Amino acid sequence: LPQPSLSLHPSQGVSLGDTVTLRCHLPRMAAWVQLWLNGTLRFDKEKDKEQDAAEFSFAVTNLEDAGTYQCRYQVSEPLWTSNQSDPVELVLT
Amino acid sequence: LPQPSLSLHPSQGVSLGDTVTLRCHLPRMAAWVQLWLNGTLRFDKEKDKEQDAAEFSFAVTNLEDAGTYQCRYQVSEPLWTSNQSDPVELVLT
Ligand SMILES: *[C@@H]1O[C@H](CO)[C@@H](O[C@H]2O[C@H](CO)[C@@H](O[C@@H]3O[C@H](CO)[C@@H](O)[C@H](O)[C@@H]3O)[C@H](O)[C@H]2NC(C)=O)[C@H](O)[C@H]1NC(C)=O
Numbered sequence: 767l768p769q770p771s772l773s774l775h776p777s778q779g780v781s782l783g784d785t786v787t788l789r790c791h792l793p794r795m796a797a798w799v800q801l802w803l804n805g806t807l808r809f810d811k812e813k814d815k816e817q818d819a820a821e822f823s824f825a826v827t828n829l830e831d832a833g834t835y836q837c838r839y840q841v842s843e844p845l846w847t848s849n850q851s852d853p854v855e856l857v858l859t
Numbered sequence: 860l861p862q863p864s865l866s867l868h869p870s871q872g873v874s875l876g877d878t879v880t881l882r883c884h885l886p887r888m889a890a891w892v893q894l895w896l897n898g899t900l901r902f903d904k905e906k907d908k909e910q911d912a913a914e915f916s917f918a919v920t921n922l923e924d925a926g927t928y929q930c931r932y933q934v935s936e937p938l939w940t941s942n943q944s945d946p947v948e949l950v951l952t
């Protein structure tokens with residue numbers, strides 16, 4: 767199970783009220799993709815087999831949105847999970 | 860996707876230092892099973908297709924172990940998630 771990689775856009779000068787996109791890149795298999803913040807699961811979503819990535823887009827609405835983002839993915843046939851992606855940091859303001 | 864159900868043993872007179880088992884009952888399909896505490900993911904693990912349940916057994920090590928436990932399960936073929944189980948409350952002492 768290949769380690770996913772995570773990108774953040776925008777990554778510089780992000781402020782409250784801005785919308786950010788965390789794009790989790792993984793293989794073209796159907797999978798449940800998770801976004802983790804500070805070592806705790808924040809969001810998950812389905813990624814159809816044909817997609818190259820799952821994207822988590824959200825508004826920055828408070829100071830606790832800052833921190834260390836990672837992504838992980840899982841399949842049930844076989845019963846496998848990836849390791850966490852290398853981290854990407856959301857720094858506010 | 861049938862809603863899972865969760866049991867807790869022991870459920871009465873539980874104290875710090877005791878070991879509890881949260882047993883998540885679901886169908887005989889291979890699946891990733893999650894244990895959630897107070898609406899945030901705590902643990903996950905694989906459940907082999909032949910198992911009737913995934914069990915999360917852990918020691919009660921602090922007061923923050925108390926609260927509302929639920930379980931959820933997911934498969935990637937098809938890309939489906941259950942709803943949360945009805946809640947079971949761990950009450951300490
Ligand atoms: C993920 O970890 C982040 C990095 O530690 C953490 O970042 C921030 O969280 C706290 C809580 O909001 C901020 O501290 C507050 O700052 C305000 C303004 O000064 C104070 O009024 C308040 O009392 C408190 O000190 C930190 O400034 C901030 N740190 C950084 C680098 O942005 C996230 O909260 C955390 N997110 C989670 C766990 O969901």
Ligand SMILES: *[C@@H]1O[C@H](CO)[C@@H](O[C@H]2O[C@H](CO)[C@@H](O[C@@H]3O[C@H](CO)[C@@H](O)[C@H](O)[C@@H]3O)[C@H](O)[C@H]2NC(C)=O)[C@H](O)[C@H]1NC(C)=O
Binds near residue numbers: 922924
């Ligand atoms: C999941 O929700 C639980 C129910 O709200 C929560 O329960 C408990 O959490 C707090 C934090 O430890 C306890 O309050 C503390 O009590 C000690 C002893 O009096 C104080 O010294 C301390 O300052 C603080 O008030 C609550 O007593 C307790 N409530 C119950 C019903 O057990 C869990 O913390 C929470 N678990 C999570 C989010 O991981």
